[PDB]
C-alpha cells in the first residue's frame, strides 16, 4: 500500500491526535504541554490551548457536544468547550501521569487512566469521579470504552490487558471480567474493533496481539511479529480487513486482519511514532511522531 499524505504539521514531539467527527479538524497534544486545533483541509492552525504543565498525552473530542478532554503529565483531566474557547473545569484525582482520556458516546462519562495504576470514570455533568477501577499493578497505559457494550479494555505495564464489566455502574459498579495474559513485557495500547468482537493490544515486547471475545470467554487469536522496538499504538482499520500499528522503531505497519501477515511498512528516517488514530467514518488516519503530526489516506499500491 501507499500513503497519500493530506496534511503535515512540524512541531515539537506530538503525543496525541483526535479527529473531529464532522469538521475537518484534528486536535494535537504536544510534549510541550500545548494543544493545537488544525484544519487539515486548509492547512490552518485555528486555535491553541494551554492548560497543562508538561506533556499532554490524552486528547479526545466529544462525539456530539462542543467539548474536548485532555489529560496531562500534571495528573489533570481538563474539559474544554471549543466553541466558547474556555477551559470549563479540571478533574483532579489521579496521582501520576494521565496516559489516555476519552468520552463515552452515550453516557455523560469521561474515561481516564494513569501511571497511578487506576482507571477513573467521571461524570462530566456532575464533575464527580463515579468509579475507580483498581487491580493493575503498574502504569495503566491505555483504556477504551467498548462501542456497544458495557465494557472497558485497559493495557498496563504489568503485562496484562484487562476487560472490565461496567454494567453495574450503568444501572459492584465495575468488575474485572478477563485478565488477558500473553504479552511478555509491558502493554502500551489496547483497542476494540468498532463492529467485530475483537481486541488489539501492543507493547514493549514488540508484539501486536489480536484477541477474540464472546460474552463468556476470550482467547488470543494470533500475534503480529516484526516491529523491532516498542509498539506505541495499534488500531483496527474500520472498513478494511487490516490492522495498523505504530512503533518507536520509526515505522507504521499494516497487517492482514485474517492472516496477521505484513502488508506494508512505512518508515520515517528520524522520527519515532507515538500514536495513530483513524476517523470514525472516513479512510483518514493520523500519526503523531517526534517531529509533529501527519494526516493521511491509505490506498492500494499502484492505484
Numbering used by the authors: 1 to 171, 200 to 331
Article sentences:
This challenge to normal metabolism is overcome by the activity of the cytosolic coatomer protein I (COPI) polymer, whose repeating unit is the coatomer, a 560 kDa complex of seven distinct gene products (α-, β-, β′-, γ-, δ-, ε-, and ζ-COPI)25–31. In particular, the S protein – a type I membrane protein – is delivered to the ERGIC from both the ER (by anterograde trafficking) and the Golgi (by retrograde trafficking)3,10–12. Here we utilize recombinant SARS-CoV-2 S proteins and tail peptides, including constructs with enhanced mimicry of the coatomer binding motif (clientized S protein), to elucidate the atomic structure of the S-coatomer interface.
This suggests that the αWD40 Arg300 side chain is important for the higher affinity for the clientized S heptapeptide. I Superposition of wild-type (white) and Arg300Ala mutant (yellow) crystal structures shows minimal perturbation near the mutation site.
